[PDB]
Design an enzyme around this catalytic site. Structure first.
Site, PDB file in Angstrom:
ATOM      1  N   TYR A  64       0.736  -1.153  -0.019  1.00  0.00           N
ATOM      2  CA  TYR A  64       0.075   0.104   0.157  1.00  0.00           C
ATOM      3  C   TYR A  64       0.945   1.405   0.078  1.00  0.00           C
ATOM      4  O   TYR A  64       2.081   1.179   0.245  1.00  0.00           O
ATOM      5  CB  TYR A  64      -1.007  -0.033   1.190  1.00  0.00           C
TER       6      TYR A  64
ATOM      7  N   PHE B 291       2.289   9.576   3.658  1.00  0.00           N
ATOM      8  CA  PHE B 291       2.216   9.767   5.200  1.00  0.00           C
ATOM      9  C   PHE B 291       2.689   8.069   5.857  1.00  0.00           C
ATOM     10  O   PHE B 291       3.210   8.036   6.981  1.00  0.00           O
ATOM     11  CB  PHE B 291       0.908  10.205   6.006  1.00  0.00           C
ATOM     12  N   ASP B 292       2.679   7.203   5.055  1.00  0.00           N
ATOM     13  CA  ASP B 292       3.069   5.793   5.133  1.00  0.00           C
ATOM     14  C   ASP B 292       2.801   4.914   4.108  1.00  0.00           C
ATOM     15  O   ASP B 292       1.517   4.550   3.448  1.00  0.00           O
ATOM     16  CB  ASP B 292       1.992   5.491   6.425  1.00  0.00           C
TER      17      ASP B 292
ATOM     18  N   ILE C 268      -8.252  -0.626   8.259  1.00  0.00           N
ATOM     19  CA  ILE C 268      -9.586   0.266   8.380  1.00  0.00           C
ATOM     20  C   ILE C 268     -10.889  -0.363   7.392  1.00  0.00           C
ATOM     21  O   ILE C 268     -10.392  -1.156   6.625  1.00  0.00           O
ATOM     22  CB  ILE C 268      -9.045   1.686   7.728  1.00  0.00           C
TER      23      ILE C 268
ATOM     24  N   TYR D 256     -10.558   6.892  10.225  1.00  0.00           N
ATOM     25  CA  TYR D 256     -10.344   6.820  11.633  1.00  0.00           C
ATOM     26  C   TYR D 256     -11.779   7.440  12.559  1.00  0.00           C
ATOM     27  O   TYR D 256     -12.271   6.562  13.338  1.00  0.00           O
ATOM     28  CB  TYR D 256      -9.338   7.814  12.173  1.00  0.00           C
TER      29      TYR D 256
ATOM     30  N   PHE E 248      -5.102   5.797  -0.654  1.00  0.00           N
ATOM     31  CA  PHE E 248      -4.143   4.527  -0.514  1.00  0.00           C
ATOM     32  C   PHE E 248      -4.058   3.675  -1.690  1.00  0.00           C
ATOM     33  O   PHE E 248      -5.254   3.555  -2.273  1.00  0.00           O
ATOM     34  CB  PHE E 248      -4.741   3.635   0.560  1.00  0.00           C
TER      35      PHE E 248
END
Length: 111
Positions: free
Chosen positions: A30, A40-41, A60, A86, A103
């Site tokens: 991902y 961010f990741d 998620i 979230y 993503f």
């Protein structure tokens, strides 16, 4: 009435008949990037794929409902919202409130 806060776009066609089942682990790469495109990741940045179990809630909502729309060997982009990611609070510093996330996962294999 928009319905569903997760939009997945197919970029690379895989098998088309092999989808991830609930209970087993899914090995996929991902890439999390903000609405503007600021990462961010990412899992591939560390040279390691992300494995998770469906229905276990280890990931998620937008991932469980989005990744299930792709087939082994497929590469699609899933659009996650602050409601599916979230909530109204989120993570301070990385994930701001009322912010949409992007993503990009790729179906590598299933375990």
């Amino acid at each position: 009435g928009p319905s569903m806060g997760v939009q997945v776009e197919t970029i690379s066609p895989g098998d088309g008949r092999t989808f991830p089942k609930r209970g087993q682990t899914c090995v996929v790469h991902y890439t999390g990037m903000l609405e503007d495109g600021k990462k961010f990741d990412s899992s591939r940045d560390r040279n390691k794929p992300f494995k998770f179990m469906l229905g276990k809630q280890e990931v998620i909502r937008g991932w469980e409902e989005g990744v299930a729309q792709m087939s082994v060997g497929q590469r699609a982009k899933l659009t996650i919202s602050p409601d599916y990611a979230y909530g109204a609070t989120g993570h301070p510093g990385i994930i701001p409130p009322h912010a949409t996330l992007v993503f990009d996962v790729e179906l590598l294999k299933l375990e």
